[PDB]
A paper describes a structure:
Here, we report cryo-EM structures of human H1-containing tetranucleosome arrays with four physiologically relevant NRLs. The structures show a zig-zag arrangement of nucleosomes, with nucleosomes 1 and 3 forming a stack. H1 contacts DNA with L1, the amino-terminal part of α2 together with L3, and α3 to stabilize the nucleosome and contribute to chromatin compaction.
H1 is absent from the stacked nucleosomes of the 4×177 array, but is present on nucleosome 1 in the 4×187 and 4×197 arrays, and is present on both stacked nucleosomes in the 4×207 array. The H1 loop L3 and the N-terminal part of helix α2 contact nucleosomal DNA near the dyad, helix α3 binds one linker DNA and loop L1 contacts the other linker DNA. H1 that is bound to nucleosome 1 always contacts entering linker DNA via its helix α3, whereas H1 on nucleosome 3 uses α3 to contact exiting linker DNA. Particularly high Δβ values are found for entry DNA at nucleosome 3, except for the 4×207 array, which is the only array where H1 is observed on nucleosome 3. The zig-zag arrangement is observed also in our 4×207 structure, in line with observations from in-cell mapping of DNA contacts.
Residue numbers in the entry:
A (entry chain Q), G (entry chain M): 10 to 118
B (entry chain K), I (entry chain O): 37 to 133
C (entry chain S): 35 to 109
D (entry chain L), H (entry chain P): 20 to 102
E (entry chain R), F (entry chain N): 30 to 124
DNA sequence: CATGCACTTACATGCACAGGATGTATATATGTGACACGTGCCTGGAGACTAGGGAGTAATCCCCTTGGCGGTTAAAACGCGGGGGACAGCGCGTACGTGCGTTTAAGCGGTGCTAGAGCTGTCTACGACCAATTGAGCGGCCTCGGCACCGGGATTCTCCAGTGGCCAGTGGCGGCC
DNA sequence: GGCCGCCACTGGCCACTGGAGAATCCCGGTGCCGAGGCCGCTCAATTGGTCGTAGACAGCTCTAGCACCGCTTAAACGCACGTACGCGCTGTCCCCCGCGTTTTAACCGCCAAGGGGATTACTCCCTAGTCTCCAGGCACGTGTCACATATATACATCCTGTGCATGTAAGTGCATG
């Protein structure tokens, strides 16, 4: 009578919810109609960027010898990638701190 | 003689410390008190989530810190190592306020 | 009127006698304390000190020209 | 209940701490009250926006959601508070 | 009794264990990620809506989203995101 | 003949004459005026859409726009705009 | 037996088109519904802003003894009002030039 | 057919005129080429977006409102050319 | 004897002139050449409405002029009157470019 | 008669003010086109009705916020030497403003011609919409190991007492006149 | 015999060095509470099918952009040359900083009140949508005076030549050694 339900995220094979993002765009007042591949494309690019920043966070935590990522790792990761840095130059992280950075003449001699 | 560090050495040490550190630098209670005080000026009997106060503290500290890196850029640009009131005035004007 | 600025300068350099020579700002404050309108006579003091340096009566310690420290001759 | 001089509640060593996190090596003595005024002007901007949001919500309880709305409206978006 | 609230924690958890099985996470870092995904989603959606208005197109397709991410995301991030989304929409098209 | 392109010339011309009967207008300053009015309209409309999104409201009322007038328009201009818009709202309420 | 076609801008005593702004808000995709008085309020606010900026422009043109509004007068008007300048700090003007501004140290003794 | 050097088309006297409009009375010689690089950087920053709008419009010819969209995207909103 | 103004006098005179004037300070056709050259680096055979080239123009000198008042305030902040590219780098970095 | 001092006199130098040049400011002339206004029109705003649903409002409760005491220090504050840094002054050597002749290329303007922006019939892909259903995603709970805290070494950096080298000051010696 | 130059000694200053002392990290051990993982629910994502319609395409057109070509003149360009400007040196005062001591209030911990955020229920006010209609503004067209440009004249300003006050140096007569 009816086939087993297969999710569109599974049909794409990506982890972000296609149906949730499509519902958000339907109720977010951006267009009267949305092409079917558009939220899939959105979920894909979101999962790519979250994946890469998670690589950066995991590398930062492993450099800090910590198993779990912290907002300081997020600060250190997001400020040392220039595309990400100017992507979020005006975006602020809770309890992130700052980069270790000292101007040259501040040092002695 | 008693030990005494030369000026700037402890300053550089605490620079390294607070750049390493992540915590808020101002006390929680007088900050919340001042936030309630100034918010009372617009409309009366306002209640505050503690999360809102902490988030405002975070944003204010970050905004101030970025203002001081701009001030540091101005001061090193002015060939000085001591920040000056005209440096903050300049940085505020360059940012567009 | 009174004496020219040269007696004022040599009195300023003979007043203190540190290991290093007296400086421009120190001698200006010395003549301000002794009594002279140093604010409009900066060029006058510069030319007087340079002329008296050329006489060999004063030797400039570290600076060049009118800057630096200034001290009296050997004898 | 009624308080007056809590701009002085941002104490001078706290401003020194912010400056050391800001990489300032030397601070003039005239700096602290100026920075107090600056953080003030900034704060009544953001809380005036927050109060406007809150009265628009028909609430007298200020939420951090309203705060992050106010900060991103000034182009100063903050992460980590439910946005 | 409570009300259900949306968050992106579990999908980011699958992504994290996909990229780093050995690495944990703090929950406030997840709050920062939730602000991240909501903010970037809102940016792309607003850009897509304004682009759809510019060409008077009442439907936003993956071409529009591609245009928007090319606008906002710079270069290397842009080209790899374009590649990932292109592969995703292609394998969805085969599905 | 071509397609109609709506512009703001006649309305701004009328308000210009009622504030200054004596003076004239240049058309590229009028292009600036179209850009200005469209810009502020877009800003306030986007802010109102954001506010209704936050309060889960499907309907934009003048309360939302009035709030946005507090938000964007600075100070004394905002109190003035509340005054004129409020009395205009009451007049239209009286049909 | 229809009523005579009366206009909503006249109903609010306004010059800006209530119907056009209402149509733009309906098709601008900002919400699914809009209140009746909301475009009235919006048109009133826009009319007030345009009225004050045109008055400032006319005063500026009178100062430069020209009978027609020039965008130089628009630049002089916007940059000399503090709340307007705060509204339009990041706005680029066509043919505006700048304010006549010379720093004090740039002038000779 | 192709072009290789038009950055020198922004001549030193034109830059001097701009700095006089900027209120600069004295200009070092090192200024001009560095400012050429800065203005150039601004040019690809706007024109990459402009090309993106143009191709997304499926047009081969660049139109002005696309430039308007790109500039207000960069927070540099231009009046007098919309529509 | 042929007259010669002292330095800065003429410079301040065209400062007053160009602050008074609104007309465009850039030769139009070299600017158009540079626009087409840079545009060809992203897409070949691009064609331009002249109005688009104009809009790009006033956007360009608007950014450039505002940069120069920023750098001028930086330079007088540095107690100098001659601008140097370090001032421009300072202004770009403080603006977050 | 010589010599120091004071007095007088001449010359160098900085400051002030008049005078010309000149670029900008101020007065008509004009002819032009941008601007402003009359006109056809059609399409977009408005009038009447409807349907239905989103928002306004009552009730409640509970959870979150507010209000209050008391140790407990860390932090704030005060004070004080004292080094380091802002900053004034000057010299000075330059690089850039200013001026003027040249070349060039920017601009005007005029023709040709075409890609291509853009407008309009068509029809179909596609996407929103409605009924069902479920399983994945979220509330709840538990527990446990990553992680916070602490205490003892090891390290590490840094400042300060000696440490020798260098340079100039200084006295003594030998030769010379 | 005294004077002068030379030579050798010596003291102070400046870069080098080892060690001490305090800060900082690191390693090991301990508890402790958020991560996260499992369990139960539910609601919303999916499936399927339909209707309508959005937009891609075909095709055409006319228009604005691109090219070119000649003329012209102002702008750029480049060289000369003076001057003012960065800026490095020196120094000098004084301003925060490190290092303590006192103080104080922040914070944590705990406890009680209640208030309004939020949630559900009910309702009806309002507004999107549809049909009809007509007039408001827009494209088009066309006259017309505001002003851009041109020309003549006035004044502000700016540099500069000259004239004055003042500081300084030199000569010399006179009183005296």
């Amino acid at each position: 009578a009816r086939a087993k339900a297969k999710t569109r995220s599974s049909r794409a094979g990506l982890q972000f919810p296609v149906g949730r993002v499509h519902r958000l765009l339907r109720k977010g007042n951006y267009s009267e109609r949305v092409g079917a591949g558009a939220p899939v494309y959105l979920a894909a690019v979101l999962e790519y960027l979250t994946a890469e920043i998670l690589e950066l966070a995991g590398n930062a935590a492993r450099d800090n010898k910590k198993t779990r990522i912290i907002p300081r790792h997020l600060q250190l990761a997001i400020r040392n990638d220039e595309e990400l840095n100017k992507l979020l130059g005006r975006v602020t992280i809770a309890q992130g701190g700052v980069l270790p950075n000292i101007q040259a003449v501040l040092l002695p001699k | 003689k008693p030990h005494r560090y030369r000026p700037g050495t402890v300053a550089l040490r605490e620079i390294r410390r607070y750049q390493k550190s992540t915590e808020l630098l101002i006390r929680k209670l007088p900050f919340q008190r001042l936030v309630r005080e100034i918010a009372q000026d617009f409309k009366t009997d306002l209640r505050f989530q503690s999360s809102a106060v902490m988030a405002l503290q975070e944003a204010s500290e970050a905004y101030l810190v970025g203002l001081f890196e701009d001030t540091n850029l101005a001061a090193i640009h002015a060939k000085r190592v001591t920040i000056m009131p005209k440096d903050i005035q300049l940085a505020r004007r360059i940012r567009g306020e | 009127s009174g004496p020219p600025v040269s007696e004022l300068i040599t009195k300023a350099v003979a007043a203190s006698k540190e290991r290093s020579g007296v400086s421009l700002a120190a001698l200006k404050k010395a003549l301000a304390a002794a009594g002279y309108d140093v604010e409009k006579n900066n060029s006058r003091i510069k030319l007087g000190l340079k002329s008296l340096v050329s006489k060999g009566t004063l030797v400039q310690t570290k600076g060049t020209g009118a800057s630096g420290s200034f001290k009296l001759n050997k004898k | 209940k009624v308080l007056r001089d809590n701009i002085q509640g941002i104490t001078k060593p706290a401003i020194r701490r912010l400056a050391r996190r800001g990489g300032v090596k030397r601070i003039s003595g005239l700096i602290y009250e100026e920075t107090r005024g600056v953080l003030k002007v900034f704060l009544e901007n953001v809380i005036r926006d927050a109060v406007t949001y809150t009265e628009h919500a028909k609430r007298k309880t200020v939420t951090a959601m309203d705060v992050v709305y106010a900060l991103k409206r000034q182009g100063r978006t903050l992460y980590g508070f439910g946005g | 009794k409570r009300s259900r609230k949306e968050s992106y924690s579990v999908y980011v958890y699958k992504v994290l264990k996909q990229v780093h099985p050995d690495t944990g996470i703090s929950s406030k870092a997840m709050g920062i990620m939730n602000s991240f995904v909501n903010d970037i989603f809102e940016r792309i959606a607003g850009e897509a809506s304004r682009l759809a208005h510019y060409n008077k197109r009442s439907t936003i397709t993956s071409r529009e989203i591609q245009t928007a991410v090319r606008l906002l995301l710079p270069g290397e991030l842009a080209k790899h995101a374009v590649s990932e989304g292109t592969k995703a929409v292609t394998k969805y098209t085969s599905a």
